[PDB]
Structures are given as C-alpha cells and as structure tokens.
Amino acid sequence: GSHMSITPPQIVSALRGRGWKASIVKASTMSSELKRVDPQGILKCVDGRGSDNTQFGGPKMPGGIYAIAHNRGVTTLEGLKDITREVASKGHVPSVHGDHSSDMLGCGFFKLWLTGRFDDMGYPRPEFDADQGALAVRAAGGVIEMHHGSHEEKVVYINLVSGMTLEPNEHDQRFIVDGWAASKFGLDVVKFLVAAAATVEMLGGPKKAKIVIP
Ligand SMILES: [Zn+2]
C-alpha cells in the first residue's frame, strides 16, 4: 500500500482553493453512521443515488473500481480484469455501475473519463467503452450495480477513517469518498482526491466537503 502524504488541513486548503466550502469533522460525531467495512460489500462509486445494491458496507471510490484503473493509468480490458481480481483478493467485491436513464453511461465518473474530461489533467483515456468495461468486470467476477433517480447530493464526505465507510441515502443524498481506500490499493492518494474533487465539480455537484478524521 501507499501512505497518506497529505494532511486533512491541506486537503481542506486545496479544496477552498478550488472554490469549495470545506471543513474537518471528527469521526466521533458521526459515530452512528460510520460503519465498519463488510468484505461482502461491493467497492462501489461515490454516486449518492439509490440503486439495486444488496451488497452493503463496501468502500466508495469514483466509478467503483474504475478509480483504481484511472489513478494507475490502466486503460485496457485485460488490465481492468486484473484490477477486478485484485480487489476481490484484497477483501472487497469489485463493482462498476450504470443507471436507468443512461444505462452503462450512467456512472458520471466513467463518462467523464471516457469523454476526455480528464485530458487536461494528463490522464490516458480508457481504451474501451462503458459497455465493454462493465462486461469485463462482470466476466472477471465483479458486480454491475444499477442506480436510478436523479443526482441530488447535498454534500461530499471525504472519509479518512480507515476500515470504515458511509452509506448512500437516496432521500438525503451525499457523495462519499473513502480516501483511506486509496492507500490500501497503493494509489497516488493526492491524485486520487484531486480527481474525486474534480469529478464532483465537472458533474456540477455540490462543492461542500466534510473531511472525516479519527
Ligand atoms: Zn458512478
């Protein structure tokens, strides 16, 4: 794994510097919501909408496992399958998702990645489309989740409490980003967080974040 080379205060700084409203929240005040990660839960997208998921308690990352492929510059189906098997071996059920309105293009993160919206940040675009990616994840043993309804996120949670997560609430929506999970998968954490912040921004999400720490 890789370590957390950026402090919560710096994260807050960075965000406010991109025009965000941000602050640090102590895990003890969210005691009732922070859930110990359940290994049978799918590692899924930050998306705040309801879905047909029945595998709760997994880590939250942009586009599900796509965040990992994205951060590492992995752009092929074979590489994506390797990541799917890697995730499953490291304690989480790998997933990606789509929705009813746009099918497999229903994951805003992937659509941004596929459409070159990360070009400016120097990211190699995927070399496959949303349909091919979803099917490759499934074929490699992962899950394809399906959301519904519209995006109504009121805030962004950047959870830095390792081994814990927050769950979606379709009636009082929020984006959830498990930053510690990036360390677990040895990702460039700073890059992972900037990418997550950018995703909210480009999707016109709320630029209000709460950084959760022990
Ligand atoms: Zn998504």
Automatic annotation (TrEMBL):
Binding residues annotated for Zn(2+) 2, in chain numbering: C45, H97, C107
Boundaries of the shown chain within the full protein: 407 to 616 of 616
Protein name per UniProt: Cadmium-specific carbonic anhydrase
Domain of life: Eukaryota
Keywords in alphabetical order: Metal-binding, Zinc
GO molecular function: metal ion binding
This protein's record includes keyword Ligase: no
Key word Zinc present: yes
Gene name of the record: cdca1
Organism ancestry: Eukaryota, Sar, Stramenopiles, Ochrophyta, Bacillariophyta
